[PDB]
């Protein structure tokens, strides 16, 4: 079968505390 | 420094001087400023904030 992966599989990009921001990054994402 | 530091060179360590303009050095991360207690919740893989 096939299904869809709706907004799954996002991970923390790096090891830095951030709060109340919007952060734009480029990596390998699903 | 994407994690806790373990391989550090031979330098001595002093005490904290809070609420005062000092020169700090935390694992090679230098600077100048004041240090106060904070209310941020670091998850146990984060060393510093941005």
Swiss-Prot record, chain B:
Covered range of the whole protein: 504 to 553 of 1255
Superkingdom, taxonomy of origin: Viruses
Protein name: Spike protein S1
Function: Attaches the virion to the cell membrane by interacting with host receptor, initiating the infection. Binding to human ACE2 and CLEC4M/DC-SIGNR receptors and internalization of the virus into the endosomes of the host cell induces conformational changes in the S glycoprotein. Proteolysis by cathepsin CTSL may unmask the fusion peptide of S2 and activate membrane fusion within endosomes.
